Every structure is written in structure tokens, then in C-alpha cells.
Amino acid sequence: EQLTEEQIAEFKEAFALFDKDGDGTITTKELGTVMRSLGQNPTEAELQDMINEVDADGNGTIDFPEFLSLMARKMKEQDSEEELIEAFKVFDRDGNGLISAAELRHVMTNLGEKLTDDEVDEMIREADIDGDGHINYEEFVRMMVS
Ligand SMILES: [Ca+2]
Ligand SMILES: [Ca+2]
Ligand SMILES: [Ca+2]
Ligand SMILES: [Ca+2]
Ligand SMILES: [Ca+2]
């Protein structure tokens, strides 16, 4: 077990958007066509680095198996990032992108933890990198995964 016929069909449809000429491979040129359509104009060197990250056999192009492997893993990545984003936006009660001590304390009380200002201040100091006494999303992620 691994993938349904419907999952493979949608991966194949995604691959086809890149594989302009239908030869079963994605070249640097084709990847460039797609990004250019999206508003980015990478150089050949930048495109090569992108292919090199996903071209497992080193033949210079990305085939469908290589694209399935990298995509399926990107979607695990994305599912874990979404979980940290949702957790953050809850802590960040006013939506300003900074969890304050007051916000952290309120949400911790709802999570069943009645903490003092000093306790909360220590939690933030542990995670605070830029020294503003607040936790931004990078600081939050960094702490949560490490
Ligand atoms: Ca092609
Ligand atoms: Ca560039
Ligand atoms: Ca390859
Ligand atoms: Ca806030
Ligand atoms: Ca901070």
C-alpha cells in the first residue's frame, strides 16, 4: 500500500503541466517555462539547483517516479507546517504575528495551566531570539521542533 489510482492520476496531471513536450521528463528549460508563467524568471543556475535537488539518478531531468517521491514528501512537509501555523494563530489572539506574554498566559489557562507572569516570561525568554519579548512564527517553530 502506497497510492490509489486517483492519487497517481492527479500526480500525473501535475507532472504534465511541467512536461510541456510530453517526453516523460522535466528539464531545466521546462521548469523555467512554468515559473516564468507564475511571475519568476530564474536563471539557468537557479533552475539547475532546483532539478539537482530532485533528480535522483543524476541524468539531468526529473521523471515521474522522481516527481512522485519529492511531491509526496512536500505534502508531508506541508501538512506538518499547517499544524504549526494553526497552533501559532490561536496563540496569537490579536493576529498581529507576535504572541505576547498576555496572549500566551490566556491560552495556557484555557489549556489547563494557570501560570504566573514570571512563568510565562521565562517561557518567552527561552524562545525569544530577536529580544522583543514576544514570540514570532519563526521563534515558535524553532522552539516547537527543537
Ligand atoms: Ca519534457
Ligand atoms: Ca534569480
Ligand atoms: Ca532523473
Ligand atoms: Ca499578538
Ligand atoms: Ca521575539
From Swiss-Prot:
Note from the entry: This protein has four functional calcium-binding sites.
Post-translational note: The pantophobiac mutant CAM2 is undermethylated on Lys-114.
Functional description taken from the UniProt entry: Calmodulin mediates the control of a large number of enzymes, ion channels and other proteins by Ca(2+). Among the enzymes to be stimulated by the calmodulin-Ca(2+) complex are a number of protein kinases and phosphatases.
Lineage, highest ranks first: Eukaryota, Sar, Alveolata, Ciliophora, Intramacronucleata
Family recorded in the similarity comment: Belongs to the calmodulin family.
Keywords assigned by UniProt, alphabetized: Acetylation, Calcium, Metal-binding, Methylation, Repeat
InterPro entries xrefs: CALM/Myosin/TropC-like, EF-hand-dom_pair, EF_Hand_1_Ca_BS, EF_hand_dom
Name of this protein: Calmodulin
Residue numbers binding Ca(2+) 3: D92, D94, N96, E103
Binding sites annotated in the UniProt record for Ca(2+) 2: D55, D57, N59, T61, E66
Annotated positions binding Ca(2+) 1: D19, D21, D23, T25, E30
Disulphide bridges, residue numbers: none
GO MF: calcium ion binding; enzyme regulator activity
